[PDB]
Amino acid sequence: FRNNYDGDTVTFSPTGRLFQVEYALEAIKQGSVTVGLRSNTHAVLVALKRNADELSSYQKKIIKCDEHMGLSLAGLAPDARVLSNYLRQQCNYSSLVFNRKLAVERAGHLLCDKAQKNTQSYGGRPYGVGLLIIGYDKSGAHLLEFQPSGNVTELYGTAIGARSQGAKTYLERTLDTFIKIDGNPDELIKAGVEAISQSLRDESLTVDNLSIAIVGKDTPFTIYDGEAVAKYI
Amino acid sequence: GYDRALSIFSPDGHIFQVEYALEAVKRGTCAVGVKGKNCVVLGCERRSTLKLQDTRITPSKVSKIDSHVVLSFSGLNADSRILIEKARVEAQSHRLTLEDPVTVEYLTRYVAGVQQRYTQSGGVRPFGVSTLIAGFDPRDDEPKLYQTEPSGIYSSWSAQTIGRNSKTVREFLEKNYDRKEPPATVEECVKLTVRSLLEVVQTGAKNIEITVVKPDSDIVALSSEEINQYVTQIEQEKQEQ
Amino acid sequence: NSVFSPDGRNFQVEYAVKAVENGTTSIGIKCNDGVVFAVEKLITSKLLVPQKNVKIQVVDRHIGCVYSGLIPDGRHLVNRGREEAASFKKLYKTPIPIPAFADRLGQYVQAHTLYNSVRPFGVSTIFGGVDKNGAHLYMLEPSGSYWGYKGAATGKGRQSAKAELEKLVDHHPEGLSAREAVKQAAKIIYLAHEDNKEKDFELEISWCSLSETNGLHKFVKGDLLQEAIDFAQKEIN
Amino acid sequence: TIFSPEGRLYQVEYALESISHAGTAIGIMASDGIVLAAERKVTSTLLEQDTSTEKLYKLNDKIAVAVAGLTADAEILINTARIHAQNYLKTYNEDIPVEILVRRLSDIKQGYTQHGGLRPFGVSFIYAGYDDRYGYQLYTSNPSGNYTGWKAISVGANTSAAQTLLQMDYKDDMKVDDAIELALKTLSKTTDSSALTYDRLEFATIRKGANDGEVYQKIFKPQEIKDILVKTGIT
Amino acid sequence: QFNPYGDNGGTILGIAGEDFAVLAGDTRNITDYSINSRYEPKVFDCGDNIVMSANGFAADGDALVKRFKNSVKWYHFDHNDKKLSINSAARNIQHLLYGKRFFPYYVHTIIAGLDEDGKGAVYSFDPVGSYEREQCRAGGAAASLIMPFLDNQVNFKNQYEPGTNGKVKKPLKYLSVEEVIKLVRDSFTSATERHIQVGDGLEILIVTKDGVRKEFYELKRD
Amino acid sequence: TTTLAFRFQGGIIVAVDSRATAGNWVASQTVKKVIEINPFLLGTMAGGAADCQFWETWLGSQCRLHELREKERISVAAASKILSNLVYQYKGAGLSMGTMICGYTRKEGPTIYYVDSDGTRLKGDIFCVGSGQTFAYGVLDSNYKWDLSVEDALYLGKRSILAAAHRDAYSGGSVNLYHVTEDGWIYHGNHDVGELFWKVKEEEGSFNNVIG
Amino acid sequence: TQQPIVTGTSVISMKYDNGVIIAADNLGSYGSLLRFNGVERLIPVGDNTVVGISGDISDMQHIERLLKDLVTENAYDNPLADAEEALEPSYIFEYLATVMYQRRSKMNPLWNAIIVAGVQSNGDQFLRYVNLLGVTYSSPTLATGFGAHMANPLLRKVVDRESDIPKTTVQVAEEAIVNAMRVLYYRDARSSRNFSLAIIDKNTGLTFKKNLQVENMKWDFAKDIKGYGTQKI
Amino acid sequence: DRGVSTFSPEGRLFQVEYSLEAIKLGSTAIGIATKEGVVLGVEKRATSPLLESDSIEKIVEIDRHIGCAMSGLTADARSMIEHARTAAVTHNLYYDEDINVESLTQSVCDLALRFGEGASGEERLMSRPFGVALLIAGHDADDGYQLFHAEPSGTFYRYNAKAIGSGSEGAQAELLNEWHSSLTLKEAELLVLKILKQVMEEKLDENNAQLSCITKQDGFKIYDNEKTAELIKELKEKEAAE
Ligand SMILES: Cc1ccsc1CNC(=O)[C@H](CCc1ccccc1)NC(=O)[C@@H](NC(=O)c1ccc(OCc2ccccc2)cc1)[C@@H](C)O
Ligand SMILES: [Mg+2]
Ligand SMILES: [Mg+2]
Ligand SMILES: [Mg+2]
Ligand SMILES: [Mg+2]
Known part of the structure; x- marks a missing residue:
């Protein structure tokens, strides 16, 4: 049942389960929390950065993919680099060949298909990273959740990582209010920073803790770190 | 076709295959290198098991890589041949492109690099060989001696030994080698090299072989009659109180 | 995978079926000139955007695909189906007939049960559309097995769906319209939801009818979707 | 291909184990020739003696091998060795020096020892050759890919016994006729059979070519072995 | 036979001021004796305060510009949003061009911006990647017509001090952006008068510490 | 193009013109025909501008790599052979360069290697390369002496380019000058042929073929 | 290396106040043999775009299939295929221009001259040209082959610069096209009487006219022309 | 024993974890970043008194503005330095500038990822992760002096100070106290030299320990034996007076 059935990504368990993929999912829960949510005009990523030491830098959780698209990571960081690189390329291909900004939904489909091939190949391993992808395209604001299983779902809001269940219950509660925060970036960011709070056995979140990203109608995807997030604590 | 990984990490942090490659070196015949003021000497032991050999034609342990650099080894004899050949090719290639023979450090860095590469490639096993590389850089009188091991680590040694009972001869060399007073001549450097083997060989007849390297491509092998004279003089001189 | 048991079975394929059984329930209904596909979408949370996690996929212009099991595997199968359909049209000019397309998927899925280096697909796929000589509905198991169907269901609610599907074949032996079968698809999905009641669900319907869609695959939306939802809600009580 | 915690190559040691059961082969090197003698593995009356060679193979005009182990494996290696000699001849217009041919083969064996995850060749060789640099030469190689030079040597069964007997009676100034005698004596004493008869032997010499200045390979015909088995006094 | 090359005419001109640079080009695109467009820009803002023109064979020109703009994008992605300096x-x-050394982009290419110390800068390239920093450079069809004018009126060459018996030179003073623009407009009207491929419109891109500014002037359409 | 390099008593002199042409069109008068590979290594450029610029810059990278790998400056012989062997790989593909690799190292002394795109590589004391090579050669050979002072040798280099800038239609603009010693290379200035010619005629009493 | 076999002649086009007009005759020539008499060289893509192709007809039929394969592909996993994620004229153009350029660069061109005409989602007129060399340009008027030499000068008398575009009515522009087609029929030996014409209007949509003919032809004056100089009867 | 890139039930890559253990077995390396430079120091650890200590290369130059110290299976670091050096030189060839320290580190961490076979995506030419960690230190115009810690996991952190190797636990908590943003280069030289003396098995001298720095002005320099000696003298006298 669990014994001879988690050797590789190419074996089914007698229950119908793929254990390597479920173990890769467990690398996410181990990772530092991050939150994403959107109104009609903007989409926001908020991430708690983690330092491995008091003398070290807090490691980055937000990667930019195009002028209209970016993601936050939770899990194995090098994997996020691999997946964002591919995503940057797909965005690039779409611009150069078709002169078209890649739809956020297609970006989802593309990440899903890439993740899938690593759940069926021998001698490979699944990706061990979860991703939250935000974008503004020709149909407005979008937020996606990516799981290394290949499952990609479009949501109004979500959170992934350690203790993430707090923020997710909060957003599920705050739904009707934040969806309507249109034409106000700073209020939506406030609603996201306040959301990541429900996921803290940790402490106060400082000016190094904290990492925020925004994209929307007339805002290219931008990253705010350090000094520039002070006004939200 | 076959790239299945053989060399991997152990829970306590070692690479098991490398570590066993060293075990093969441990059981290989002893080799020793000591450097004089203006020379480097290389000695090796020969086993007793079979003694009906042909010494004219059997590959000796000290090999010329170029006309100024030599290589001795301990471990799997067959594995060593692959390293020596590659090293010889690299030497000719370095002369071709840089228009100058290799330094002894370069040649060591090259051999150690090949050794390392076999610890991290799929479907290959590491070399069961450790090496002593000795010689003189072109247009230089300052003597060189280096040692490599299956891992790919290398470094220089005033004197060193590898193979079975290398512990005993290293212990002998640590006592009898003075850095401020290194063996002043070829003759007195060869004598120290033989003394160190005599701790392990227990005989010394055609069981000890000695190669001497000097500045500017002067590399001579010693004959039985020339080694005998050293062996005889050592036990006779050192006996009384 | 490439391992036969002593009694001639393939345990890995049998286990792959368990992954299918575990999944959402999806159905397909064959009507007198087209086909209807419907699927149950479990609403995990209010945070999921309604109407915006489309499960039903189009292949070429005239084929619809729905699947239950590991969703990513289904997408992998549809990508392949699309390559296989493009290739066919490139050489033969005509769009791929449905039986022709079924076999293309069939051989591909079977291939994934021949080699120790691969796992079988963790899906069952219901698919079909309108070609040169009528409407066709298929279902394809993880073993590569497939046959034609009058009606087909897979996933968690497969048994009650089959029971309802068996009843329709008995009451309408002479046909059954596209407009009717769309309604009926809404009903059967609602009934099959009984098993997954702990969470809310969203209904997705699509059809490919010769007279209603001009033999092209189209999503059921707006007034037609609402009317079918009503029928299902009204006939559940 | 992997190492043991001892620093041994499992598959090689097991290949060598396989060899110790193969019929003994003996090489003796004299000043004016070389002897190759080998024992065929317990056969049958119906085996065609005349058209059979399971242990002694010609490599070129001046080099030969005695085989101990898997014959089919040996034929693979012999064939490539035969080619290597012809490549050398084409390149230099000189017959390949014996050691170069031995080293080459030994390297192909060393290869299977170090990569590719294929079983080593279950073969041991005794090489008998002449060239104008080292004169008469005798070499041995085994599945590890190590090779060594010898004045007398054996491979296959009872090498322990055969080597002690050769060490006892071998002397550096031997003629070929004395080396023929030793080789047969040694086999007879180490056999696991009632008597060493012609039908169970393969025999070859590399002499100084009757009367010339050239080198001649004599592979003994079945009848010639029966003759030399009487001459030496074993009938 | 199939000839992979063509020639779309046009002329471009780049002058480096003290704290500014201009890159100008006519907006006419031609094939043999026909006009294709009267307004088809060939000077582009590439981000990071760099302007670029690749004049000659338009398909090779656009392909290069497209590919460099892309290089700028990936420079950001790989080097933490660093500004790509003009020299870099x-x-x-050079590598993009030389990359195709055995099937060249058939363009004379010019870029313009501000260097590290905020000085005006102009770089010009041959088809296979040879490049040099220059005070000013004209390229394309009417290059042979305009360059000597610029040698004379920008670097004051052969102009001596009146009455010094031709020994003291006209001091090489710096030009204002108004004085540069004047020289550009005049260079292009002269070029339009005497070259059949030059005409229709003039588009100038001006680069200062404040960004990229655009200016347009009608040209004779014959 | 005219470029020269010669060895003498007190090192190496390197001198080049600065004219670039496309047909009969003078493309540039301010072109830099020397690459400063490093504090101890210079390379000269004749033939295709791009070919030289691109491959001699690459050479500099390859030399930097040698220093990091070997913890010692690359020998002139080796730096030259790198560029030489690269060029050879491209033989017959159309590469067009005439090049001198000049420098001082402890082991070699001051050394000049001539390297062209045919693959030829020559060690020598005097070389002129380019369309104006013969003109430079005419002055250089007739006034050369091993024992020449540093001041004099620099002039002979400068004067030889001028000779060639005068006669060869494809040489001109300015002379760029370099001195290479035990301690490395020192720039000896840009010299516009405009001014230089009249100065040299005046002070030296040469160039009587010239009216006024 | 290659050479055109069955060919089509000019494609002619202009912008007017609300959209674009494009026309091309229905002939496929085989050298100087007027071989095929019902060839359609206007390609509707979606219904905001018409692609007009001249040059080699086999390569034309290739591009046709590519364009159809592009509609299929855009519809895949795209719920907004007939809405905001429909194929735009610019998307179709950039794709073709990429293909054209890659093919010439591989020394194996699609032996064509293509004009992509249509209306953008925001209402903007789109009119651009690409050919076998990958050369691209845009203008108030565009034409290929002979059309370049004879249609452009007449069409430019109507729309001479940008500012002329809002001053030009559907009727005026269509008339100018229809007249240019007649002129081409008079003087192009590789032309036909029968032609298709398409109007892409930001209000009307796509109007596609088949089986048009050149009307009101002047030939009467020919009766008075005698000999080649001196002949009177 | 099954595979090389298999996940544990916890969600960790087996082989990556054990390589981290291999690094703990290695010699101690310490890096301290100030506003006047970065200091890199290592424990030579000769395995015998006949080993010529100065042939132990554990601090290497990458470019004029980037140097690094290593700890673990140090042979595994050869090709990492080759790649680093090439990336720096190449970057300069393409861009006529210095490679940013952060960019050089990321490049080195990409190389570290290439264990596998191809891993349904690209290609992987290596059978196991590297068994060595690196302290990459340097200067660039954007972020000044920097210290990174490159791990075989493919992650890298920036540190004000950091220690790796066998002494690394005790050395790190020691750095936790002594480091402040006002540190001079001379102070930082002393701190590395002091903290090494603490954790080393042997008595620290100019033979079994090595110092180096990188400053914007003079580039990356490995201090020679005469110079470190004088800084050891100065350490003794400073602490004997305390
Ligand atoms: C050595 C050096 C270094 C810096 S300046 C210089 C002196 N060289 C020069 O002045 C040479 C002299 C002419 C020449 C000789 C030999 C080979 C090629 C060209 N000039 C040059 O190299 C000049 N370039 C050119 O003359 C040039 C001409 C055509 C060309 O490719 C066009 C093409 C043709 C067919 C198909 C596709 C593309 C590339 C470069 C450059 C300065 O603009
Ligand atoms: Mg079922
Ligand atoms: Mg820069
Ligand atoms: Mg004109
Ligand atoms: Mg001249």
Whole structure:
């Protein structure tokens, strides 16, 4: 049942389960929390950065993919680099060949298909990273959740990582209010920073803790770190 | 076709295959290198098991890589041949492109690099060989001696030994080698090299072989009659109180 | 995978079926000139955007695909189906007939049960559309097995769906319209939801009818979707 | 291909184990020739003696091998060795020096020892050759890919016994006729059979070519072995 | 036979001021004796305060510009949003061009911006990647017509001090952006009068510490 | 193009013109025909501008790599052979360069290697390369002496380019000058042929073929 | 290396106040043999775009299939295929221009001259040209082959610069096209009487006219022309 | 024993974890970043008194503005330095500038990822992760002096100070106290030299320990034996007076 059935990504368990993929999912829960949510005009990523030491830098959780698209990571960081690189390329291909900004939904489909091939190949391993992808395209604001299983779902809001269940219950509660925060970036960011709070056995979140990203109608995807997030604590 | 990984990490942090490659070196015949003021000497032991050999034609342990650099080894004899050949090719290639023979450090860095590469490639096993590389850089009188091991680590040694009972001869060399007073001549450097083997060989007849390297491509092998004279003089001189 | 048991079975394929059984329930209904596909979408949370996690996929212009099991595997199968359909049209000019397309998927899925280096697909796929000589509905198991169907269901609610599907074949032996079968698809999905009641669900319907869609695959939306939802809600009580 | 915690190559040691059961082969090197003698593995009356060679193979005009182990494996290696000699001849217009041919083969064996995850060749060789640099030469190689030079040597069964007997009676100034005698004596004493008869032997010499200045390979015909088995006094 | 090359005419001109640079080009695109467009820009803002023109065979010109703009994008992605300095851009373009040394982009390419110390800068490239920093450079069809004018009116060459018996030179003073623009407009009207491929419109891109400014002037349409 | 390099008593002199042409069109008068590979290594450029610029810059990278790998400056012989062997790989593909690799190292002394795109590589004391090579050669050979002072040798280099800038239609602009010693290379200035010619005629009493 | 076999002649086009007009005759020539008499060289893509192709007809039929394969592909996993994620004229153009350029660069061109005409989602007129060399340009008027030499001068008398575009009515522009077609029929030996014409209007949509003919032809004056100089009867 | 890139039930890559253990077995390396430079120091650890200590290369130059110290299976670091050096030189060839320290580190961490076979995506030419960690230190115009810690996991952190190797636990908590943003280069030289003396098995001298720095002005320099000696003298006298 669990014994001879988690050797590789190419074996089914007698229950119908793929254990390597479920173990890769467990690398996410181990990772530092991050939150994403959107109104009609903007989409926001908020991430708690983690330092491995008091003398070290807090490691980055937000990667930019195009002028209209970016993601936050939770899990194995090098994997996020691999997946964002591919995503940057797909965005690039779409611009150069078709002169078209890649739809956020297609970006989802593309990440899903890439993740899938690593759940069926021998001698490979699944990706061990979860991703939250935000974008503004020709149909407005979008937020996606990516799981290394290949499952990609479009949501109004979500959170992934350690203790993430707090923020997710909060957003599920705050739904009707934040969806309507249109034409106000700073209020939506406030609603996201306040959301990541429900996921803290940790402490106060400082000016190094904290990492925020925004994209929307007339805002290219931008990253705010350090000094520039002070006004939200 | 076959790239299945053989060399991997152990829970306590070692690479098991490398570590066993060293075990093969441990059981290989002893080799020793000591450097004089203006020379480097290389000695090796020969086993007793079979003694009906042909010494004219059997590959000796000290090999010329170029006309100024030599290589001795301990471990799997067959594995060593692959390293020596590659090293010889690299030497000719370095002369071709840089228009100058290799330094002894370069040649060591090259051999150690090949050794390392076999610890991290799929479907290959590491070399069961450790090496002593000795010689003189072109247009230089300052003597060189280096040692490599299956891992790919290398470094220089005033004197060193590898193979079975290398512990005993290293212990002998640590006592009898003075850095401020290194063996002043070829003759007195060869004598120290033989003394160190005599701790392990227990005989010394055609069981000890000695190669001497000097500045500017002067590399001579010693004959039985020339080694005998050293062996005889050592036990006779050192006996009384 | 490439391992036969002593009694001639393939345990890995049998286990792959368990992954299918575990999944959402999806159905397909064959009507007198087209086909209807419907699927149950479990609403995990209010945070999921309604109407915006489309499960039903189009292949070429005239084929619809729905699947239950590991969703990513289904997408992998549809990508392949699309390559296989493009290739066919490139050489033969005509769009791929449905039986022709079924076999293309069939051989591909079977291939994934021949080699120790691969796992079988963790899906069952219901698919079909309108070609040169009528409407066709298929279902394809993880073993590569497939046959034609009058009606087909897979996933968690497969048994009650089959029971309802068996009843329709008995009451309408002479046909059954596209407009009717769309309604009926809404009903059967609602009934099959009984098993997954702990969470809310969203209904997705699509059809490919010769007279209603001009033999092209189209999503059921707006007034037609609402009317079918009503029928299902009204006939559940 | 992997190492043991001892620093041994499992598959090689097991290949060598396989060899110790193969019929003994003996090489003796004299000043004016070389002897190759080998024992065929317990056969049958119906085996065609005349058209059979399971242990002694010609490599070129001046080099030969005695085989101990898997014959089919040996034929693979012999064939490539035969080619290597012809490549050398084409390149230099000189017959390949014996050691170069031995080293080459030994390297192909060393290869299977170090990569590719294929079983080593279950073969041991005794090489008998002449060239104008080292004169008469005798070499041995085994599945590890190590090779060594010898004045007398054996491979296959009872090498322990055969080597002690050769060490006892071998002397550096031997003629070929004395080396023929030793080789047969040694086999007879180490056999696991009632008597060493012609039908169970393969025999070859590399002499100084009757009367010339050239080198001649004599592979003994079945009848010639029966003759030399009487001459030496074993009938 | 199939000839992979063509020639779309046009002329471009780049002058480096003290704290500014201009890159100008006519907006006419031609094939043999026909006009294709009267307004088809060939000077582009590439981000990071660099302007670029690749004049000659338009398909090769656009392909290069497209590919460099892309190089700028990926520079950001790989080097933590660092500004691509003019000199680094110049070197980068050399590799793009030389990359096709055995099937060249058939363009004379010019870039313009501000250097590290905020001085005006102009770089010009041959088809296969040879490049140099220059005070000013005209390229394309009417290059042979305009360059000597610029040698005379920008670097004051052969102009001596009146009455010094031709020994003291006209001091090489710096030009204002108004004085540069004047020389550009005049260079292009002269070029339009005497070259059949030059005409229709003039588009100038001006680069200061404040960004990229655009200016347009009608030209004779014959 | 005219470029020269010669060895003498007190090192190496390197001198080049600065004219670039496309057909009969003078493309540039301010072109830099020397690459400063490092504090101890210079390379000269004749033939295709791009070919030289691109491959001699690459050479500099390859030399930097040698220093990091070997913890010692690359020998002139080796730096030259790198560029030489690269060029050879491209033989017959159309590469067009005439090049001198000049420098001082402890082991070699001051050394000049001539390297062209045919693959030829020559060690020598005097070389002129380019369309104006013969003109430079005419002055250089007739006034050369091993024992020449540093001041004099620099002039002979400068004067030889001028000779060639005068006669060869494809040489001109300015002379760029370099001195290479035990301690490395020192720039000896840009010299516009505009001014230089009249100065040299005046002070030296040469160039009587010239009216006024 | 290659050479055109069955060919089509000019494609002619202009912008007017609300959209674009494009026309091309229905002939496929085989050298100087007027071989095929019902060839359609206007390609509707979606219904905001018409692609007009001249040059080699086999390569034309290739591009046709590519364009159809592009509609299929855009519809895949795209719920907004007939809405905001429909194929735009610019998307179709950039794709073709990429293909054209890659093919010439591989020394194996699609032997064509293509004009992509249509209306953008925001209402903007789109009119651009690409050919076998990958050369691209845009203008108030565009034409290929002979059309370049004879249609452009007449069409430019109507729309001479940008500012002329809002001053030009559907009727005026269509008339100018229809007249240019007649002129081409008079003087192009590789032309036909029968032609298709398409109007892409930001209000009307796509109007596609088949089986048009050149009307009101002047030939009467020919009766008075005698000999080649001196002949009177 | 099954595979090389298999996940544990916890969600960790087996082989990556054990390589981290291999690094703990290695010699101590310490890096301290100030506003006047970065200091890199290592424990030579000769395995015998006949080993010529100065042939132990554990601090290497990458470019004029980037140097690094290593700890673990140090042979595994050869090709990492080759790649680093090439990336720096190449970057300069393409861009006529210095490679940013952060960019050089990321490049080195990409190389570290290439264990596998191809891993349904690209290609992987290596059978196991590297068994060595690196302290990459340097200067660039954007972020000044920097210290990174490159791990075989493919992650890298920036540190004000950091220690790796066998002494690394005790050395790190020691750095936790002594480091402040006002540190001079001379102070930082002393701190590395002091903290090494603490954790080393042997008595620290100019033979079994090595110092180096990188400053914007003079580039990356490995201090020679005469110079470190004088800084050891100065350490003794400073602490004997305390
Ligand atoms: C050595 C050096 C270094 C810096 S300046 C210089 C002196 N060289 C020069 O002045 C040479 C002299 C002419 C020449 C000789 C030999 C080979 C090629 C060209 N000039 C040059 O190299 C000049 N370039 C050119 O003359 C040039 C001409 C055509 C061309 O490719 C066009 C093409 C043709 C067919 C198909 C596709 C593309 C590339 C470069 C450059 C300065 O603009
Ligand atoms: Mg079922
Ligand atoms: Mg820069
Ligand atoms: Mg004109
Ligand atoms: Mg001249």
